[PDB]
Amino acid sequence: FACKTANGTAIPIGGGSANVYVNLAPAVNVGQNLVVDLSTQIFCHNDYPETITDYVTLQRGSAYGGVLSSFSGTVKYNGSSYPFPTTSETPRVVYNSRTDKPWPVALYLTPVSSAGGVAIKAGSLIAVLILRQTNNYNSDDFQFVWNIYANNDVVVPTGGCDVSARDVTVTLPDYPGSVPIPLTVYCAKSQNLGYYLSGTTADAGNSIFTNTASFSPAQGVGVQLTRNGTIIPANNTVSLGAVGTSAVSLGLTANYARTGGQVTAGNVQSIIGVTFVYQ
């Protein structure tokens, strides 16, 4: 019994350790969010299938690493879901062929937010998985340890919903004018979803975001967001109603708005946060 990764990295008979670099494409699913499917990354085979039956489990202690380490979740092992990090050894999966077959492990994260996310830097550790191999032949009891690393920069969604983009830049027409903000949201299943804006505002009504352009700034204007004409102030929750698998546009438009005094030539910039909530 031995195993290898998609890139050919091997752990031989008797167990050992290997680093597994994976391209992540996390996604929200119903009641759990996919972090990574390793069934395309890690493979094992039985070296003497005529004589011996090999048994493989996911051993307790298997857990997330890095920024994900505080997150509870589930692991799908050969189709069935089990708590993650593993606090008890999974059932055994039989290996009975010299042909390399997948180690059927997929890691999920339990939603703790509405549409939040956590940034994963490329090259960082995301999980350590302990594969335990036994058999019906002798008392062989071998540990194959897989250190799972992100091969790319992604953000893992931590909520029941996800967004079209985590960072959006729009460019207003030269003053005066407005521009649509492309921003949509969807949920794995129906959620009663709302959102609120956050940022530095210039007015009493907390509805005009300050111009913070550092170089050659204009005077007398800020940025004001509207939703089909309705002014959206900061820290005021807007309801999107029920949001399901079909993307829903937040319907936001950016505008210039007078903040007081002579309007002067120069650059305009406002940074505005969007945070989703359940209702």
Partner: peptide
């Protein structure tokens, strides 16, 4: 925040 919007614009004199 879950999302960060950057709004750029400019005032041109005339």
């Amino acid at each position: 925040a879950d999302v960060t919007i950057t709004v750029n614009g400019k005032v041109v004199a005339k």
